[model samples]
Target chain A: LKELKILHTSDWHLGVTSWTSSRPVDRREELKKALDKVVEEAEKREVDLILLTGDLLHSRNNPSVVALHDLLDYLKRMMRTAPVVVLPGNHDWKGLKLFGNFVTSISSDITFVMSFEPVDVEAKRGQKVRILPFPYPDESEALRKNEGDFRFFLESRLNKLYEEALKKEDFAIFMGHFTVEGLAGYAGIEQGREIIINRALIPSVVDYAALGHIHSFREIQKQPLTIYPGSLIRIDFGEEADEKGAVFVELKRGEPPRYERIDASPLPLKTLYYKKIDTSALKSIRDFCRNFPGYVRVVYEEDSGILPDLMGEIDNLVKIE
Target chain B: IHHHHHHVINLKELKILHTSDWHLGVTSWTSSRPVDRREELKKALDKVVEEAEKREVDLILLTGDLLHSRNNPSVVALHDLLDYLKRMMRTAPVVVLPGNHDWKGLKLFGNFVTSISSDITFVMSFEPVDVEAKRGQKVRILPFPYPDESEALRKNEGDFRFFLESRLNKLYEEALKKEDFAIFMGHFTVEGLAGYAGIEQGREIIINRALIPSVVDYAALGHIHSFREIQKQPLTIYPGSLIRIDFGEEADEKGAVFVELKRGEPPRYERIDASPLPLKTLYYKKIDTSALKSIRDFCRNFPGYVRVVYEEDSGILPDLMGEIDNLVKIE
Candidate 1:
């Protein structure tokens, strides 16, 4: 019998504005609405545990505090039945001061993964899952500062978590915030340098390893069941083009977990590359507004005073700036 | 404060308390001035809240460096401060900005501000935020977080200038639409300010005065320990730290400044009396065996902490403890 159904997701990066642009407010609102939709979907599916891997907020100095508070309030109201386990990513470290404390205070349903020690979260009657929440270090070299073999230190922690899961006869699952090797289609090598989760770390003792930190959603080759749910919202222009979503995993008592994707609406921000537009060829700016996305930013340095008036003709074009 | 006709604001005499640099966890490595200085700091903050309540201040501008470090205690202290501020002035809005010590790289300080009160706006970057007064005047705040590293300085320079200009332009534009008062609050370094030359502990990037754009009605600055005004801009003033966190900051008048402004008028600044601790004199005395009695008599007159800056041969501090009751800590 299937004991638990878990919705795995990470990298919400809430309150983050656009990196080089000025659309974080609307993007954050949309992301909040998307998160609400995710929770609504989770409630409908009756998922046992909602596993949020990490990177809950974008920047430490986020402008929208009320929006985040409202989002969490909404999540708490929605997750009345399912237990939500949240492990902090590199963005949400402990020593940084303000972040984890507020998260702990607001949402009682959220179990923040601060310690390296494994926490046993009961999914249902007779079903147990071990979660080793590794909060990202503020400085990448913090773990290396401690004496002893660095790889050995990492392996020992992973082994300790796996060892605990082996003792449990019930359906045992491991949730960690890490980056697995050999995952393809990643933006670049440097994108996830901090997270180094070797395939060797995934011992057969654990039924499944739900990993986070890596933005792209994928399953590690070594362990078929081990998966990365990826970030909730698109962080940059590179991410905006990519397909983003959360994974719904159906866990059985003794069988392999089956998973599926619940599609998320990519935020309506588009970068149009206009190399050359003949002034005579282009008839009206209203024609351009009707063709492209809502928040369209033109990157050309051409004279376009009439373009603003045409763009303004559309209801969705809030402002050019 | 310009009375703008854009929003319907009731005409009222608005009172505002301007204070800065509550370095909560900062300890004087050189001397032990006050053992209960933390309590004193708390008391001073509480007093501000109480005073605001009594005076019915419309707003409180906690300029910058709300915490000593980017640590847990800073968050707790800020949280307590916010709670106290809310309790006293429920209707008033508090604007907080990050100084050199409380930059975003530290992370926790910004988080603390966001977590605490909906009304408390922590300006971490170079952006002009329009704050609506109970009266119809719009106050624009331009906050610049501490630029600690050279890279941060480079990144922040243009952004800061742009924000200042943009906000000022916006205020001018808003004034054109309807009259509005624009006030800019920032944590920055001015060239001629009588203080330490470098940034916070010399780690911060040196921001030139030329980088600051000229548009604000009042530019409230922090990061410097001394209280003074930039001679160039009559509207710009530095209120300095509330408590003396270091011996180097001894002679400065550490206190909050009270200011009053009217539509199309320059703000008038009044230096309020800081806590008694900052007002006292700090002296370091070194005495040999022959002058011990004289030193003790001199120490009685000076109530502040005394450090014995002795030569290698003079082993005085160990024996001098019995003579002085107010001898804080000897380095």
Candidate 2:
């Protein structure tokens, strides 16, 4: 049995009210449910550490207050077993340094490693677990905005992080918050939005690379075991490609970590397209769409005439953000 | 670091930060009016805490509608707010009186509806409380519970409304002699105190100022969503909601007031920008479908909470909602 286990998650995007182009949910509650799923997995599996790579918030300056409060509670639950390590992703406030004090005041236990700095976490059986943070650069450069030929800038920063991480003592976990060069980008409209990272920039010395920024779950690298655990909850329609949850890593001091996926989908966030029906009956439309409780987007096939009856007897669904 | 909004209030004056109309746990922050309004309030509370501490406020008077309604989300919001007030009350005292939406206000207190913390004084009855301010100055509070006599849900129970209705002046006249500063805190709307605008007209209680005994140093009010100064005598004021909850209040400044109360003198107060976000950020308006560019012009830089009211035959009615967004309510 491995002496330590790691649970990796990212991109909660808390405070996002709209799920679809049309449907919206107070999703902070669902966000809480998704977090609970992660917590339940940790307790059931007895994981030793929690790694949140980045983009935990929807907006850095104005995050969902309800979601932030829940994050504090859920992080404490994770810290009960092992200290939770967090790195600011693109969705987080640029100056996490600005009001970081007040944010820390809410949840004091969640540890954030925002630089090339490394923190040594004591693993069970006395093995030291080193977590090296590869956080985004300053808010200015991190937005991937206006810095022409941004690849060179990102490459230099990645080189600094990789060089620092390669100096680990026993075992080190590289946690990052940017896009990988070769992996699939955001499935929907955000295809070219990420600051794509070159695979060569990351070194194989680190035992595990927990990455964020890309929403879909994929293992982009093999030797060093790099993974974007993906967003814990389904936030938008572009994220309807696959299941979402946290990644569990089984690790030993001298071994490469083996990972497994735990599905943490919150509230069955689904989208349905309106069928070309022969009749205008509401029940017929409901049957055709296979409607259920959750955020649903009804895209009409042709020239849409009205707010169709596709949402018949929609129990929880309403007309609000 | 704290973004300080420091103001040098008079040393002899008791500074009270009056704010209200939280409507916490509301689910209508956005246009679709979802059931998750607690998030909007969360940001507003965070802002109020930051701003209040910066001004070194003496007393926090939250005059009503603390919760949106008696619902599950409101209960969650109450717990969160209680915890927030507990942390903030270490430096200043907190006072909460229920409004029309608060399930008969304090006339009916739930388990979590009792006194928020040690420092929070929830006035459920018709009594005058003499609280010691920072300088040990006796600042008396003549509190009034909302007259739960509204036609919607009337609990013909003990008439706390009638009790206060008969004794507004008697209590104020009595407290003026005993305390250094007498402040009247009530959740009921005052007559001639800036009439409701846009919406919320005739939907609230309006008590005549003639009934109120003109003796208190200040009259802190609530139930209205606008920041208004109704009278100069005794300085009656409604600091409005900490944030704009709905379209009716979109035009009003979303903020709180830092009061400089001098004993036996009219208190001078200034409005502090207490919104975590900008005011009028959320809007609700009906787009005239008879015109085409109306929809295009409206959404230019608009964020959320817009209700489009195009005519039934106004061409844009059918495809407008399907196109504009589910983010906007279509009527």
Candidate 3:
């Protein structure tokens, strides 16, 4: 069976200063650990290709040296196993020129897709995978006035790509970084603020739809196998309970693609709500909060003097009422 | 009337302003002083523009090292650089190359700037580019970035200089194809130049005079902080850093080079002075009234940053230290 194995991951968010309940914590170590795991898995499985959807960095401006160097180092490591394809998200597109040129200068295997283009890569068994990259469209390039304008714009562009894909017999994947209408409650997607793309427009051309911009794993469409592998780590408190990891997929022409979610363990986070403060409940809460490994946010209706004492017990507790 | 206008235009020579190594965003190594490094860069850059406008320069060439680092560029430093480039674009077309300290950050801005306008040329590739001056002087420029030592050794085969010289000759052959002027702009060290104040020895790979093709009319170079003219016939020149980057560069006459070029004629060149921030250092063997008075006067009246050096036995007086401005450095 001539099949290609690919590891799909997105939203590394390296150099993110994640907020715990109490204060901000630099998540460089945790992010590195998760990426290291991803690389290890890629090497172990002998995956033929690796795709990074986007949001590799936390902020576009004032990027730290630690973050940039960390990304470059990991990129070199990842390329040793399989060819890595990176498409920048909205938060990271501004810095791609510097990164892209440097990556090209070092190695040819690492592809940094900056513009809207199609890249063809050969897998282990000589299977060709044509990748159609729709990077987070720059403000000037896309229709940005309203959802209707952007929706029509996306549909037309995808259809144009679909028309191109129909001309070829090669297996194609539509890799993009944006939100769809029905897929909601993930990061960077809320009440029409983001360009909510039409989900109905995906299946025409895509063999495997690798998407990003949502921080949680989701299989949006079933038949043609469209999914978001999600972020490598828990980005915020909103995604504390959501499973964190990457997606592994097997693709072969004229067959249903096999895809599985590879789980990554994130730093533990819990939110506790207390209606009334009492001595008995406080004793149990103090032990519960102190023994907890990760971050904890306590939402109390009334402080009643126990709140002050509880705060002193654990450094990770923050008050939210 | 059109023939007369064409004659007037043909009579004028192309004036190219050459500059390199502003080293913006560098700070005091010993102290976290509020040294106005960005302001000094802006002032020097303004002087450069003032010279360009006054001399009616045709094109501006920033050979390399516009910023201190790719990763650690301050917001103010980036804004200052963009503003400087914007101001220069108002007068003449510009060309920028990358040096050792420069990183991809500048390339990002370069791409953005080139996308918006056609006047500025940002050369990040190894290929030769053709540029036309305002007076219609056709010139071919070969942009060579600072060669990484590791990559150089691998490419060296056996002899480093031979490999580099051979490579440059190949590029120069292309540059010589039907152009009025051939300009070789690179960001690396040349043979026989004295090392600058901050340059570490035995680290940088130096190329000899043979690396420059004899057909090149002028070679604008960088990575050396002081000005030096390597050859006169081919006119290889390092305009040096735009400003005194540190105290080691205090005596270096920092400026841009103005070159007037025409086909089949020798180029006429002169130095355009840049008013860098005034740097002064005061040495005190003792912390007496005389020393304190001298330090206070140097701190109060000097319009630039100061470095105060005191004997180990006689440390700096706390009261006098408090009197100095934030830009003052005590050692």
Best by lDDT: 3
lDDT of 1 by residue, A216-240 (tens): 6777743438887776666554565
How would you encode candidate 2's per-residue C-alpha lDDT over B192-236 as one tens digit per residue? 654557345555555777566577778888877888887888688
After superposition, the stretches of candidate 1 with alpha carbons farther than 4 Å from their true spots are A1-321, B1-13, B30-36, B70-91, B100-118, B134-136, B147-179, B195-215, B231-233, B278-286, B298-303, B310-318, B322-325, B329-331
Interface RMSD of 3: 10.9
Q: What is the TM-score of chain B in candidate 2?
A: 0.77
Better of 1 and 3 by DockQ: 1
- Report the C-alpha lDDT of model 1 over B66-105, residue by residue, as the tens digit: 6766544544565655455455335356677765442324
> Can you rank all candidates by lDDT, best first?
3, 2, 1
Q: What value does the TM-score of chain B take for model 3?
A: 0.84
The docking category that best describes candidate 3 is incorrect
lDDT of each model, Cα atoms only? 0.60, 0.64, 0.71
- Rank the candidate models, highest DockQ first: 1, 3, 2
Name the better of 2 and 3 by lDDT.
Answer: 3
Tell me the lDDT of model 3 at A237. 67
- Highest-TM-score candidate: 3
Listed per model, the TM-scores of chain A against the true chain A are 0.76, 0.81, 0.89
Q: Which of candidates 1 and 3 is the stronger one according to TM-score? A: 3
Clashing pairs in 2: A60-A93, A320-B32, A320-B33, A321-B32, B26-B37, B27-B37, B286-B309
Fnat of every candidate, listed in order: 0.00, 0.00, 0.00
